[PDB]
């Protein structure tokens, strides 16, 4: 472990056989600055201020990812095809701000200890599935080389609606449901 | 029954201490969750981390062009991007929203950077005994959160004060809660 | 004008 005032990743480069798929992102003190949409070839910055003064070209990410694809296939042979081990993720659900009934708020679903980085995070309202007003972060890196992902559900809290965060992972036998209510 | 996956990670990390004065880079080459090779700027050469690493570490250490480019990354990536951090991340100052809900929870919401100090007061006095605070909560959208609970047995005249300090403030945020009935 | 972000390059494993 290294003691520093600030820790940054320029960047987190991920490529997995399943898919196959990959990820490119820059992190600063555990927060995601941007991610590159490798299909669209676009940099998606997380804060508005950042675009004004910073610019990352997507090709650099795509090029790094090709190198990772090359390295992966060589290291799989050297390891005698040792596969990834499935970890049990930890789910925590909390609101963004204090709950005021009938007023804009966001429900936060933290999924920690994710490995490997393949996960389904969905929201339920009174048991039924919600699709609109749902956003999520990329797979945020951890020092132990596992990941955490945070899902968001914008809503106006009410006395008649109860929510759940359904998480599907290979390290789970059944989908994990974490309940939240105002 | 579970799908097979082979995972590769590359982490290009920068460690910054005392403004610009101290900068350290560590690049990490990871197979699944195993770091097998790394370049540390304080070391200056590639080092294997597990028996999976010597073929990669020795080969990159035999390429003087690879060594030069990686050593220079402390300037071309770390010191460079830190100048961009001073204009962005290290500029961001989000003031906390402090509220009291009734035993008495002081919720300090949506602030940036992480540094926070919350203090509970009953009337004139400060309260050390009955105070239970949650750890710092990362929301993931460049804001933090913290909730400080206070075990209180409220009397008739009592005024409860949550006192909050943060780098974004010149003076502390004082929020009060008067005793009911 | 925004300045170009620096990025680390992964070292390439020996193909042969």
């Amino acid at each position: 472990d290294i003691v520093a005032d600030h820790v940054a990743s320029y960047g987190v480069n991920l490529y997995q056989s399943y898919g196959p798929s990959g990820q490119y992102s820059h992190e600063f003190d555990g927060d995601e600055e941007f991610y590159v949409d490798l299909e669209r070839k676009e940099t998606v910055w997380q804060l508005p201020l950042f675009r004004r003064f910073r610019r990352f070209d997507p090709q650099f990410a795509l090029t790094n990812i090709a190198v990772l694809k090359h390295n992966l296939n060589i290291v799989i042979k050297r390891s005698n095809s040792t596969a990834a081990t499935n970890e049990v993720p930890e789910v925590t659900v909390f609101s963004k701000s204090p709950v005021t009934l009938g007023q804009p708020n966001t429900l936060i679903c933290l999924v920690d200890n994710i490995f490997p980085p393949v996960v389904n995070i969905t929201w339920l309202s009174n048991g039924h599935s919600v699709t609109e007003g749902v956003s999520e972060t990329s797979f945020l890196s951890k020092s132990d080389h596992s990941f955490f992902k945070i899902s968001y559900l914008t809503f106006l809290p009410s006395a008649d609606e109860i929510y759940d965060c359904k998480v599907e992972h290979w390290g789970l036998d059944e989908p994990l449901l974490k309940h939240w209510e105002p | 029954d579970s799908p097979e996956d082979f995972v590769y990670q590359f982490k290009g990390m920068c460690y910054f201490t005392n403004g610009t004065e101290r900068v350290r880079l560590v690049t990490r080459y990871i197979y699944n969750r195993e770091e097998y090779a790394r370049f540390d700027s304080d070391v200056g050469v590639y080092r294997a981390v597990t028996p999976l690493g010597p073929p990669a570490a020795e080969y990159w250490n035999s390429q003087k062009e690879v060594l030069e480019r990686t050593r220079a990354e402390l300037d071309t990536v770390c010191r460079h991007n830190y100048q961009l951090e001073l204009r962005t991340t290290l500029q961001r100052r989000v003031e906390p929203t402090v509220t009291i809900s009734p035993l008495l929870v002081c919720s300090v919401t949506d602030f940036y950077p992480a540094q926070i100090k919350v203090r509970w007061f009953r009337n004139d006095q400060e309260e050390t005994t009955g105070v239970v605070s949650t750890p710092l909560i990362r929301n993931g959208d460049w804001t933090f959160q913290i909730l400080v609970m206070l075990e209180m047995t409220p009397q008739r005249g009592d005024v409860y004060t949550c006192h909050v300090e943060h780098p974004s403030l010149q003076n502390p945020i004082i929020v009060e809660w008067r005793a009911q009935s | 004008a925004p300045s170009g972000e620096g990025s680390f390059q992964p070292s390439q494993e020996n193909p042969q």
Epitope: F60, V67 | R69 | G4, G6, Q9
Partner: T-cell receptor, first 112, second 110 residues
Framework: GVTQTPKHLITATGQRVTLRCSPR?????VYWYQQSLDQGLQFLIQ???????AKGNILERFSAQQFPDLHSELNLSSLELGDSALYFC????????????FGPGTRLTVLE | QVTQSPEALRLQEGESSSLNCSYT??????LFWYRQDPGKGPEFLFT???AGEEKEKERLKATLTKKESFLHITAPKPEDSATYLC?????????????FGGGTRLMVKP
């Protein structure tokens, strides 16, 4: 290390030509550059491990390929007099900031 | 943007000189020097990543600052006559391509 065929090419307008390149032994990334008297040395395209990477202000008339043996082919169709230039192939070990090593080049002359 | 000066240089045998290569951007990945015989492929000379960096081989010495790079040529011979090309790799660029300067046509009069 980098070889390029043919060394010279003389052809009529409207024709299509193929320029080949063999990178340095062990080099996985290839880059094409055009050297004209008007624009000087300009980047066309890059290939790594058989796929397109960086791309210049190249025209739809221009297309390249990188074969599994890592040799590249630069295809220039519907040729104009302005396409008369030197076409250099460069190769590097990896596709990042690695040193780019140029081939002898192909001199193309497009005549009416 | 990468600029080279002078466009042409006429030196006498043994007459030491310097070649300038300015780059207006900030965000370097690498600065490269090549020597090109007319019609032949550019021949690689030096790579500099960082300000205060310097490299030397034979009669050539390359240096780097935040604004530019100098190519110092001490006591040149007629064999040193060529087009000296400066190229940059940049963060602002759409990948790892090189952006070349206009070059310096060096002519060493014996």
């Amino acid at each position: 290390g980098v070889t390029q065929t043919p060394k010279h090419l003389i052809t009529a307008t409207g024709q299509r030509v193929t320029l080949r390149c063999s990178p340095r032994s062990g080099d996985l990334s290839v880059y094409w550059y055009q050297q004209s008297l008007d624009q000087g040395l300009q980047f066309l395209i890059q290939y790594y491990n058989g796929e397109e990477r960086a791309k210049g202000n190249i025209l739809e008339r221009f297309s390249a390929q990188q074969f599994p043996d890592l040799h590249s082919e630069l295809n220039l169709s519907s040729l104009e007099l302005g396409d008369s230039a030197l076409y250099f192939c460069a190769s590097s070990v990896a596709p990042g900031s690695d040193t780019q090593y140029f081939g002898p080049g192909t001199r193309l002359t497009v005549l009416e | 943007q990468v600029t080279q000066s002078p466009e042409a240089l006429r030196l006498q045998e043994g007459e030491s000189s310097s070649l300038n290569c300015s780059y207006t951007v900030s965000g370097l990945r690498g600065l490269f020097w090549y020597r090109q015989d007319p019609g032949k492929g550019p021949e690689f000379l030096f790579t500099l990543y960082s300000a205060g960096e310097e490299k030397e081989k034979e009669r050539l010495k390359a240096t780097l600052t935040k604004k530019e790079s100098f190519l110092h040529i001490t006591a040149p011979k007629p064999e040193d006559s060529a087009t000296y090309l400066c190229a940059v790799a940049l963060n602002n660029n759409a990948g790892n391509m090189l952006t070349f300067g206009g070059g310096t046509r060096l002519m060493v009069k014996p």
